């Protein structure tokens, strides 16, 4: 079923701060030190964006007050082969980039059942400027800071993964494990609009998701 959602953004997760750049996980290895979301070993992806959510408002396709649904059976968030959170809704956005490469962003609304912390290689998006009408793209810094990111029991989080897929466009959910790519153009899409600078505390972010 399709559920429309209103996510109330909480405080930024350290090292993110209120008026600074948003730091997202970049590397996908070592496998036991990164957060993975998926069905099985051949169907999963590694998170980049993490955002604390303090209140979730549930709506149906017909926009009526809905009650918090059960987690989607099968989807899970794991750290070092151990499930740490349940996924309640998800959505994947695909947008073409170069006629043979598409940006595919997966967004997961999760609730952490067991608190955990990771120590990942973080980075942030950026775009340079030139005094010309020339195209300037959004890229990841290609440099990484090694720092700890913490997730608390009972809290709800919005996790995102963005990969670039080469070839014909895929139909159905695309599972793909890939780090953020150096010197590669990215466009802000429906899934990473909140990953430039942190959304204001108590502001609301909207999604149309599947359960």
């Amino acid at each position: 079923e399709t559920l429309k959602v209103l996510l109330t953004v909480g405080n930024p997760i350290s090292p993110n701060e209120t008026n600074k750049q948003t730091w997202v996980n970049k590397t996908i290895e070592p496998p036991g030190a990164v957060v993975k979301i998926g069905r099985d070993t051949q169907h999963y992806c590694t998170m980049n964006g993490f955002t604390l959510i303090t209140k979730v408002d549930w709506f149906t396709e017909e926009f009526q007050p809905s009650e918090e649904p059960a987690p989607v059976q099968g989807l899970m968030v794991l750290l070092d082969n151990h499930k740490k959170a349940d996924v309640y809704a998800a959505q994947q956005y695909k947008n073409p980039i170069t006629n043979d490469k598409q940006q595919v962003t997966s967004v997961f609304l999760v609730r952490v059942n067991e608190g955990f912390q990771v120590t990942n290689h973080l980075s942030y998006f950026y775009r340079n400027s030139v005094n010309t009408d020339a195209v300037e793209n959004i890229k990841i810094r290609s440099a990484t800071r090694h720092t700890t990111v913490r997730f608390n029991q009972g809290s709800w989080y919005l996790l995102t993964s963005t990969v670039l897929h080469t070839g014909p466009p895929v139909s159905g959910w695309l599972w793909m494990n890939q780090e953020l790519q150096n010197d590669q153009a990215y466009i802000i899409d429906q899934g990473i609009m909140h990953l430039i600078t942190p959304p204001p505390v108590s502001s609301q972010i909207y999604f149309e998701m599947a359960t």
């Binding site: 496998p31 036991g32 099985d40 070993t41 051949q42 794991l78 070092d80 082969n81 151990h82």
Partner: protein
């Protein structure tokens, strides 16, 4: 140093190729070999020279690991190809540090938890294989005994590795685009020199080669008393 075992199983081996082979290591040196075709735990390198109870016990242990590794492919729903890799071993802490990790088709998905004496993992593949191995007689019990007692004690016994070999050095100038420091047959493999690469030799020594886009080269190795310069 370390005592590690590299377990590998494949669902569809090539003709005349083992479906499950093992390599045993004491640091950078391999001392044990095993494969499903021979079914024998055999010595490697200088370890061939001497008793029989030790190698007989290892052969039976690796046959049980072979049965479980092949059993894992059946535990998964049959759809090839499959590759199960295992990393079992330990190190002698100041104590011990065990290692037990498994990968399915190159993806890390399981371990062996030491608190709950079984194989840990919440992936749908790690819940079926860890089940099947648990459903085998005393399989988990032996693994806990190996990772915490047998491996550390076996390492302590062997420490009652030190052989050194200085690297032969050569420095040559290739035809650089308009406008190579290599070391041969050194041991231990720890050695520092641009774009260096590192690899082994058939005799157990090692080989490294770094070239810079252009002068002397500096080498530091455990077989050399002091770092040595290199001339063209």
């Amino acid at each position: 140093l370390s005592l590690l075992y590299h377990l590998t199983a494949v669902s569809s081996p090539a003709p005349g190729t083992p479906a499950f082979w093992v390599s045993g290591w004491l640091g950078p040196q391999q001392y044990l070999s095993y494969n499903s075709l021979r079914g024998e735990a055999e010595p490697c390198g200088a370890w061939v020279w001497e008793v029989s109870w030790y190698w007989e016990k290892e052969t039976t242990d690796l046959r049980i690991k072979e049965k479980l590794f092949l059993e894992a492919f059946k535990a998964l729903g049959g759809k090839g190809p499959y590759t199960l890799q295992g990393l079992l071993g330990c190190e002698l802490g100041p104590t011990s540090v065990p290692t037990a990790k498994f990968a399915l088709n190159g993806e890390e998905f399981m371990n062996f938890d030491l608190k709950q004496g079984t194989w840990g993992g919440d992936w749908p593949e790690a819940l079926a294989i860890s089940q099947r191995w648990q459903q085998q007689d005393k399989a988990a019990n032996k693994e806990l005994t190996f990772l915490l007692f047998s491996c550390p004690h076996r390492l302590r016994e062997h420490l009652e590795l030190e052989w050194k070999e200085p690297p032969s050095m050569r420095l040559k100038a290739r035809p650089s685009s308009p406008g190579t420091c290599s070391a041969f047959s050194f041991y231990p493999p720890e050695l520092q020199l641009g774009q260096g690469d590192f690899g082994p030799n058939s005799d157990g020594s090692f080989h490294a080669s770094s070239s810079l886009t252009v002068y002397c080269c500096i080498v530091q190795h455990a077989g050399l008393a002091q770092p040595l310069r290199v001339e063209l």
